[PDB]
């Protein structure tokens, strides 16, 4: 009977081990390690390691992998004790943060020096987690690869299939000023909606096929980006973006849905813009006050 251990490192690895326990994976001992003692406390695993207990003190490592690496080096002997006797160790972690990125290679090294067949299985971050977290993941992937027998890499980008966020907020307003279309707004109109207004609200929604206007305008008004708060606003800008075949009536039908949701006496400017859309119509809103 082979002795098999899975050690999940950092938050992603801790949640993956939770999923394995919950799905009844048999034949395996589970261990979780983290610099954050909070995640560790709600773990379903009965083998719990707080990394860097004397230095990070269970408070978490933050963003820098160097802290997670130093944390695991400090806990080397307790990691060896938990893994002792394994024929095979899986090191599970999400690349991109301070703990999994930096601690996973140290734990793999200790498992393999103990004599275990050591397999890393990791994720890499969404591109829209940004360059710092993706760059860290690249470096941690290579360091882990040095210390595992085999390395399995699962891309969160690809797992998607099976962001333009800041771009879309900007274009929402600027296409209506600088790119002539069916309906546009003067710069002075934007300025009155947005001068000295404080917090503004962004929503978005898309709708394919006929009556795509009703569908897209309804998704926009309850977009999670709005956080369920659109009604009452004193002013609001509405962008209706679509393809070549975009009737001014479809635009008016979309804006109608939203004027109802806003309220009474709401200054609602709006306009259009054409994009590269098979009956697919996108509605964005920004509302203030």
Ligand X SMILES: Nc1nc2c(ncn2[C@@H]2O[C@H](COP(=O)(O)OP(=O)(O)O)[C@@H](O)[C@H]2O)c(=O)[nH]1
Please name the helix (run of DSSP H) or strand (run of DSSP E) that holds residue 124, with its range, or none: strand 117-124
4, 6, 16, 51: which one binds ligand X (CB under 6 A): 16
8, 52, 100, 203: which one binds ligand X (CB under 6 A): 100
Total binding residues toward its own copies, as defined by CB under 8 A: 89
**264 contributes a contact to its own copies by CB under 8 A:** no
**120 contributes a contact to ligand X by CB under 6 A:** no
46, 66, 84, 154: which one binds its own copies (CB under 8 A): 154
CA–CA gap between residue 222 and residue 217 (Å, rounded): 9
Structure tokens at 24: 């009844």
Residue 24 or 77 with smaller CB distance to its own copies: 24
**Least gap, CB of 257 to its own copies (angstroms):** 19
81, 211, 227, 256: which one binds its own copies (CB under 8 A): 227
76, 182, 201, 266: which one binds its own copies (CB under 8 A): 201
Tell me which residue of 76, 78, 68 sits closest to 34, measured CA to CA: 68
Residue 76 or 127 with smaller CB distance to its own copies: 127
Please name the helix (run of DSSP H) or strand (run of DSSP E) that holds residue 135, with its range, or none: helix 131-147
CA–CA gap between residue 59 and residue 37 (Å, rounded): 7
Grouping H, G, I as helix, E, B as strand and the rest as coil, residue 217 is helix
Tell me which residue of 186, 159, 163, 182 sits closest to 247, measured CA to CA: 182
- The answer to whether the CB of 124 falls within 8 A of the CB of 159 is no
**199 contributes a contact to its own copies by CB under 8 A:** yes
**23 contributes a contact to its own copies by CB under 8 A:** yes
Enumerate residues 220-259 that contact ligand X by CB under 6 A. Answer: none
CA–CA gap between residue 24 and residue 28 (Å, rounded): 10
Enumerate residues 42-61 that contact its own copies by CB under 8 A. Answer: 60
**98 contributes a contact to ligand X by CB under 6 A:** yes
Residue 87 or 157 with smaller CB distance to ligand X: 157
The partner in contact with residue 28, picked from ligand X, its own copies, none with C-beta cut-offs of 5 to 8 angstroms by kind, is: its own copies
Sign (positive or negative) of CA dihedral 216, 219, 221, 225: negative
Sign (positive or negative) of CA dihedral 36, 37, 43, 45: positive
7, 49, 52, 97: which one binds ligand X (CB under 6 A): 97
58, 169, 274, 280: which one binds its own copies (CB under 8 A): 169
Quickly tell me which residue has 């109109």 as its tokens: 189
**202 contributes a contact to ligand X by CB under 6 A:** no
Q: In degrees to the nearest 10, what's the CA dihedral of 107, 108, 109, 114? A: 90
Sign (positive or negative) of CA dihedral 109, 111, 117, 118: negative
Residue 11 or 261 with smaller CB distance to its own copies: 11
The partner in contact with residue 274, picked from its own copies, ligand X, none with C-beta cut-offs of 5 to 8 angstroms by kind, is: none
Residues at the site binding ligand X, with contacts judged by CB under 6 A? 10-12, 15-16, 61, 94, 96-101, 123, 125-126, 128-133, 156, 159, 163, 165-166
């Amino acid at each position: 009977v082979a002795s098999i251990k899975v050690i999940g490192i950092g938050g992603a690895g801790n949640n993956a081990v939770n999923r394995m326990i919950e799905a009844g994976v048999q034949g395996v001992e589970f261990i979780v390690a983290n610099t954050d003692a909070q995640i560790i406390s709600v773990s379903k695993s009965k083998n719990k390691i707080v990394l860097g207990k004397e230095t990070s003190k269970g408070l978490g490592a933050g963003a820098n992998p160097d802290v997670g690496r130093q944390a695991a080096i400090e806990s080397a002997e307790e990691i060896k004790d938990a893994l002792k006797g394994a024929d095979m160790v899986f090191v599970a972690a999400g690349m991109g943060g301070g703990t999994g990125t930096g601690a996973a290679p140290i734990i793999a090294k200790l498992a393999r020096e103990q004599g275990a067949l050591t397999v890393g299985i990791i994720t890499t971050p969404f591109s829209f987690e940004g360059r710092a977290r993706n760059s860290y993941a690249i470096q941690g992937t290579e360091e882990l690869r040095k210390h595992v027998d085999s390395l399995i890499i699962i891309s969160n980008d690809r797992l998607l299939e099976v962001d333009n966020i800041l771009r879309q907020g900007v274009q929402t307003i600027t296409d209506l000023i600088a790119v002539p279309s069916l309906i546009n707004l003067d710069f002075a109109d934007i300025k009155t909606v947005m001068k000295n207004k404080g917090n503004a609200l962004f929503g978005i929604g898309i709708g394919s096929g006929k009556d795509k206007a009703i569908e897209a305008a309804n998704k926009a008004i309850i977009s999670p980006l709005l956080e369920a708060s659109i009604r009452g606003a004193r002013d609001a800008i509405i962008n209706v973006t679509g393809g070549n075949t975009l009737t001014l009536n479809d635009a008016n039908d979309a804006v109608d849905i939203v004027k109802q949701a806003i309220g009474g006496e709401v200054n609602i400017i709006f306009g259009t813009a054409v994009n590269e859309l098979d009956d697919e119509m996108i509605v964005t809103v920004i509302a203030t006050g």
